[PDB]
Amino acid sequence: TTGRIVAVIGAVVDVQFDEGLPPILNALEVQGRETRLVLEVAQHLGESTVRTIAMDGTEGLVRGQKVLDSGAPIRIPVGPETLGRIMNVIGEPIDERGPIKTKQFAAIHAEAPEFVEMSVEQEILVTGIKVVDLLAPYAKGGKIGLFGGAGVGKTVLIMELINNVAKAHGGYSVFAGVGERTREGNDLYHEMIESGVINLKDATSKVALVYGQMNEPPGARARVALTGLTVAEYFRDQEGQDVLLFIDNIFRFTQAGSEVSALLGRIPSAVGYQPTLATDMGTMQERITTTKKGSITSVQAIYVPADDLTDPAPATTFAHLDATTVLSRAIAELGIYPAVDPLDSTSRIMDPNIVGSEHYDVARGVQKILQDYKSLQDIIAILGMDELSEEDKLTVSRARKIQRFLSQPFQVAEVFTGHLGKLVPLKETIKGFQQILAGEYDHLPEQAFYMVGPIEEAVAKADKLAEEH
Amino acid sequence: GVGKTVLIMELINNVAKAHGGYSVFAGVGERTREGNDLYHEMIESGVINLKDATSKVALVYGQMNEPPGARARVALTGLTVAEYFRDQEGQDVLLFIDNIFRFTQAGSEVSALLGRIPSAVGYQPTLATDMGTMQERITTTKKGSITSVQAIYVPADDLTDPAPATTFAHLDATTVLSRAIAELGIYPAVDPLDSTSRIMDPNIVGSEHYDVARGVQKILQDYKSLQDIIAILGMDELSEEDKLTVSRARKIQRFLSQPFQVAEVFTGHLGKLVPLKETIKGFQQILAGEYDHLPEQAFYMVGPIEEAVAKADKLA
Amino acid sequence: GVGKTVLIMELINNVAKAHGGYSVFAGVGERTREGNDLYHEMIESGVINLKDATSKVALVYGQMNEPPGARARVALTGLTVAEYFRDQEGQDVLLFIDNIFRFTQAGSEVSALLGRIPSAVGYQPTLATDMGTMQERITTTKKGSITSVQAIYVPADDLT
Amino acid sequence: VGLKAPGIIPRISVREPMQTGIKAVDSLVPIGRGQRELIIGDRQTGKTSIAIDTIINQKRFNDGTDEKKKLYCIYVAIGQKRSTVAQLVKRLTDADAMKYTIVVSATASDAAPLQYLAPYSGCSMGEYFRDNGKHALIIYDDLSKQAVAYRQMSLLLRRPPGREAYPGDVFYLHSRLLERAAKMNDAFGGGSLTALPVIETQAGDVSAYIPTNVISITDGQIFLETELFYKGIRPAINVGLSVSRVGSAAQTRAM
Amino acid sequence: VDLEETGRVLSIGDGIARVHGLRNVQAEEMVEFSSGLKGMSLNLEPDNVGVVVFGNDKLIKEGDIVKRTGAIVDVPVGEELLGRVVDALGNAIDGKGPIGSKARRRVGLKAPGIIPRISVREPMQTGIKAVDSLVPIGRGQRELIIGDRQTGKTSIAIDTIINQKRFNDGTDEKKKLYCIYVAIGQKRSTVAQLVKRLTDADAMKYTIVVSATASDAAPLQYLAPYSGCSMGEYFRDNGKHALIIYDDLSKQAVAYRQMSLLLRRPPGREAYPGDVFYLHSRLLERAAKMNDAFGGGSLTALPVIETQAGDVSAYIPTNVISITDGQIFLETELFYKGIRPAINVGLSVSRVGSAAQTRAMKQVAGTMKLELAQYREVAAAATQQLLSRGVRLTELLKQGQYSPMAIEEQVAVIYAGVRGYLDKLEPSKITKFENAFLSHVISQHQALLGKIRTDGKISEESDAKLKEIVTNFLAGFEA
Amino acid sequence: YFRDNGKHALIIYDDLSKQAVAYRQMSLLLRRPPGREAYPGDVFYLHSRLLERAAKMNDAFGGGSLTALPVIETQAGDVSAYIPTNVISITDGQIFLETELFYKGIRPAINVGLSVSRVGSAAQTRAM
Amino acid sequence: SAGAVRDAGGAFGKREQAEEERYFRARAKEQLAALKKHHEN
Amino acid sequence: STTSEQSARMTAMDNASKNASEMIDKLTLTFNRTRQAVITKELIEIISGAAAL
Ligand SMILES: Nc1ncnc2c1ncn2[C@@H]1O[C@H](COP(=O)(O)OP(=O)(O)OP(=O)(O)O)[C@@H](O)[C@H]1O
Ligand SMILES: Nc1ncnc2c1ncn2[C@@H]1O[C@H](COP(=O)(O)OP(=O)(O)OP(=O)(O)O)[C@@H](O)[C@H]1O
Ligand SMILES: Nc1ncnc2c1ncn2[C@@H]1O[C@H](COP(=O)(O)OP(=O)(O)O)[C@@H](O)[C@H]1O
């Protein structure tokens, strides 16, 4: 069957057929082009006509141009051949290494795992980050969200997790570049070659790469998230192994929808977004999950426009996550990195039965003193530190040390900071904050706890500062 | 009602009288009686002569009583009169528009009826280009020259409104009139931390003019930062360094105020025309701390610094 | 928690006792639970009587369980009952509306569903007229009068 | 799914207590059988935890022989993810609560019309117990996401939108739902349906459009603060703002 | 009359020609009217074609014959455009004859992918003390110049362009950087003074000026940034390096909106189109650093954004901030105080710790970075070292217009402030100190400055030589 | 009629605020593009053409006059609102009344700082 | 809610953080002297 | 000196709370004006979007 292009307005393209009308979500190959141009069917307008969305630039297209129906949706390479290889939304390689010689294929659109296929295994995942492991620890198989404003440190945080987790993890991984800087994709590609994750000379790679950056049109960025998770769905379902699914940034998926929602014929919803924001996110997010067969531990970076967490895009995403890491700009401007909010980061596994009572009491103890510290700051604004009582002065002294002891220099961010990277164990993290709350380091200065690994280096740094003074 | 018409009448009273070339007034969507007031006042002064053929001003009027199409195109009509003197004759023209917002305001009314999709805050989508084609004509070419003092209305005291916001790009010098400053009694109510100019540069005006100008804007900024602390706690809780900063700032605020010649009928005080060189010396002395002993109200509504000291001597 | 229903019942009683005028209670868009609470309190007090014809109130309910078309016209229904006692019997009538915000909300919902471009703060273009045509009927006349005690929910505690 | 609520006559003031098993609630903000008590607050404040503990607490009465004091629970998951409902159903199974609990689930993957109907479907199931002399509890978790589903449905049908892009009758959506939850007098069976709607406030904003509607419908509300949660108050129920007008009468004299 | 190749106008108003026919026309293809004006077919519909008119549409009547160029919208590119003021389409508008270009490149080409790119190595010197030391820009980077009206946004761009003279006059070819200024919605008097300012500083001979002013139609203002980017790509691909300044992207979005709304495309947030992020993203992504295999050159982008009342959280600003690598906030508070340029050191950042500063600046700037951060906390007992030092350094960060300094010259003025030769000196006298000190070192000590450039760092001999200069200069300055 | 036939007349629009909302109703039902507080673009033109007709005629045109006293209702003393500022920019002076002064019993409650009338000052008795 | 003064980032917020930083700069110098004397003696 | 200092604190804190209350009343009105403006503006974006279709 063949169809002719009848209208072209931006990313949206209308194609009319004579008899063989294609269903929705089908890939349409546009004939008479230099590069490949896939159009995905969105709506059936009527009178044997369908409204589609372009996966690449629409410049050059003419009215009455031939368009062939593929028959099935956008199908892409899947298996071990995708590892160590960059690919498009539509599946074509873009790393200048010839075609991908895959055995099996897989459609980017598919029904989400049913209620009976859901797992309930909540095992802790030790990242090596002090703020995460203590306050909002991630689960092995669960869904992890990294909320943050512009430049607060989402991309540095996700690459730190790729550095720590993916190398230690034996199974395969997948990185989905969605509407972000291609420069970062270039840096991420060469960095994994240096560390020895992606291998060029032989086939022993542990990371698959899918990229649809902000240079691409709306249709491309709205579908790479599906293209990315489809590769992870193979490593979940077909191969019985654990998988890691890194995404950056998942906001650009929901953003990309709104860029063409007006042209598709939808009435705009609140804050300029599409009315299908909940369902389009729902059908996508629900596929990214740990089934009974496999297990995908996802780590999604979430952009928050103007640090506004009430915005529909991030607000709707909170329901889909098991563990959250909300990055704050106010904390970032103090110098505390990673700028994770200790009073706005939660997790399902944060329970005395799951991670023990010693983990729970210390973690909650840090959040108690940090919350009380905010109440005193209001009183300090008028009175001052000197006028306060000894009980209140002690609360602020311990709290400010705990704030700075949460900070940690990453291995990925050595060039930014200057200090050497660290990686604190689980029991070392728990013991560190336990001693500070108990009041065993009241005599030491607060500067020693800023940007250090375990509690041992805080005492060691206090010696260097003592000698200099 | 902040003081644009009073300001533009003063500038005409000051500059347009002491000028060799011609002048052009364009009443765009404003009060019709003001046109009558201006017309007879110019006959009284002599700039518009009925008997002789030596008139220095050309009047054009499409006031708020007229329909939108008239008010939308009258700005271009008066503009074209000034362009003739610039292009063909080659004269230094003094253009005066009041109010240029009514050009853009009239555009929005017809835009609705022209069958266009409305832009932000119900404005026309062609807000920038309609103003652009109009404003770009008002400029000094190689042959002639046009000096335009345009009064700009601000809807609901909101400078972020599309109409005034777009106008900022088409201006060499801005003069933001605040209501808060007017309500205090400081006339003209020109906001010193908002009004700006492109010729304000040490290369053009000089380092003495520049350094004194930014010294005034610095201490007023420092005074504005402490308003929250003064309101709640008070002046007593401020340090001695801060007390001096506040005292001088209030005196500098009041010395910026000035009695106008056009406002002689309204206020009663005689108008003052302060020279350029004496203006810099006045504020420079206050910044250095040569008049800390004097009170604040002595600086309120005076010409040069000499009359401020004379007013303080009157008080005892 | 402030004896609202007790005050309402007393104004019904005292106006009927002194001025000899019957009352009307228009339940506009509030809780049906509250309508049940008041109905039995009025029977307990005596302003409503199920045994004999000595009742002082005519109840007209159209609560939040009913559609916006109903809720918008409930005040007019109760108003019309009050207009009888003024126009025909020549009485000083007492018309309660609980509450006037829900009459305004229902008018906003009906206007929205018709597809009329909304006014300021999401309210209908016909805000003043819808209120005006109802409130103007509540007045003193040659024959009698209708005094109205209208409950008001101020949204967001904002009088503007 | 579409049925009108009981009128004036069939109803009666709330009398029998609805025990949640939470000290802060049962003592200071008591709920009654047939009442509509809102569970409102920010994300991660423990809204669902109030509902789940209430369902687990009913095992004490349902295991007993006294029929009047029993309570059949209903949890309506709206716009959640399946792994969360899977965890939720496991928790009720572990506590031996599922045997008397219905779980209606319209998850994020499901189409908008299903999320729109799920509360009304769940309500009609609860109405069966009310109209047979028995008592039922229903939890709408949450009505915020229902409005988004109803908005999507109405907007794509080209129906005229209102405030915050929600349709004109967005207030009527929750009103007709919640009004169906009631306490029937002896003459009309004697049963009851108790509603526990849930709302997600953005940044503690109780005066937002959808919260304000549901607060004005319900007989009371239980405000949950993020500040109180981290300070140590768990459950983080703000006593000052949280109230229950109807359920104060429906409470044991001992308490 | 052939309806396939040519077409007749159905309706024309507000620069939107609806054309009947043109059945073989492509999307985003240029078209010529009977009057002579050019257009661009964006909306292809079954019954008509929505064409936008490049220039004044008032000559176009109903039933006019619309021809085809038979090619996607493109502009001329090359080295002949250097020193020439041109419009959005690439035509000369300075009365210096036609352009002698022998090459054309499309306006809307895709940005280089993952393979052609490479990490940013080379430095992009703006010649500004506050920028090069604290917020260093590398070649093939996007650095946003955000700020309010009249806060020296354009002033940063001009000082950067004039700073390239020392590199372009030199023998080294790879150290060069050709500039490309793009004016969007600015009045011609502002651009006329701008080009003269470049002409007076001998800066035009290596700079291109794409002028799309307010008198010009919205399609030209929309296209102008893409046309200038294509001219920059010519250098990027073919070995050489280039700089481009979008001044500004805020007024482009207003033009793009006007054009879109008149094409009957539905409005979005603040009446803007749905894809205003896509507008600036595809433009900025083209700015990149190419590897040696493809060429080695790069394209550095300096986009400008105008914020209303210091609202960086607005719609269009938040879009551009997320796109660009780093941003430079220009606050009005510092501006009115006297701190010019008014670059907020706390908020402004640059995401690149590569060889942008060089080894000489890295030493002196690193210590200045900490001390200013220490100062900013205290600024809001024996501890006046931190408070004084910070105020002294802040005065050194001031810099007059049209006076860009070399990297070695900037190290000299900072060396005095960091080591503590301005502590006892009065804050107001630092402007006169630096003026006389900078003029002194440039006049006589050329070998010192030359050795810092040769060694690329402050050596032990140069450190000892600098000590003797500043200590004697201080004593001479004071009475 | 009086103005043109050499007679002086007074007119009181009580109030133009309630006229504006009436004209807003018509415009919103006409489906015209709304702006500030859902008011159409020509709400200024609505009151401008009305008030301009109030004028003082010279002896050549009868020597009559028409004096206008338009009324405006502000919400919470917000004189900077859209409709007040439009009517303020048309009229030749304002008489602002405050709730504070009126509540204390100072009646008529007139804000002397904000209320002005420079045009009427010229037409005042020398005794006053 | 709590911590609203520092969230606003006004004069009171900046003066509050400056006050804290001053106090703990003093206490830092005292405690470093304590570590000096403890290390030596 | 204590009784004089205590009475001044009482008076100073009284004025601070009263001056703060004065500013809250102003900000409450400014908040309500801006609250309505955002509701009205954002609605006009949606109506304009629907009308354009
Ligand atoms: N470093 C400086 N020293 C002295 N004056 C300066 C400096 N920087 C800018 N100015 C002055 O400020 C004025 C405004 O600067 P500029 O036009 O570059 O800012 P802008 O944000 O581009 O303003 P706009 O875009 O509205 O024209 C200039 O006319 C100039 O005289
Ligand atoms: N009484 C309590 N004591 C201790 N922890 C509690 C209590 N109640 C809730 N929590 C904890 O708080 C977290 C959030 O609980 P819950 O999911 O019920 O809140 P929620 O507001 O419904 O979250 P969401 O809105 O995101 O679904 C859980 O991890 C839970 O363990
Ligand atoms: N762990 C960290 N240590 C030090 N600086 C960091 C860290 N994370 C982020 N940053 C700072 O933020 C910038 C990078 O932020 P980025 O990860 O790009 O945020 P986003 O992805 O949200 O834009 C860098 O310039 C760096 O200074």
Ligand SMILES: Nc1ncnc2c1ncn2[C@@H]1O[C@H](COP(=O)(O)OP(=O)(O)O)[C@@H](O)[C@H]1O
């Ligand atoms: N220089 C001034 N001195 C004193 N009062 C002034 C001055 N300028 C304006 N005013 C006051 O402001 C009022 C309105 O001035 P006007 O120029 O008409 O404002 P607008 O142009 O905004 O309508 C006048 O009635 C006058 O009382």
Ligand SMILES: [Mg+2]
């Ligand atoms: Mg990022």
Ligand SMILES: [Mg+2]
């Ligand atoms: Mg005026």
Ligand SMILES: [Mg+2]
């Ligand atoms: Mg929940």
Ligand SMILES: [Mg+2]
């Ligand atoms: Mg500029």
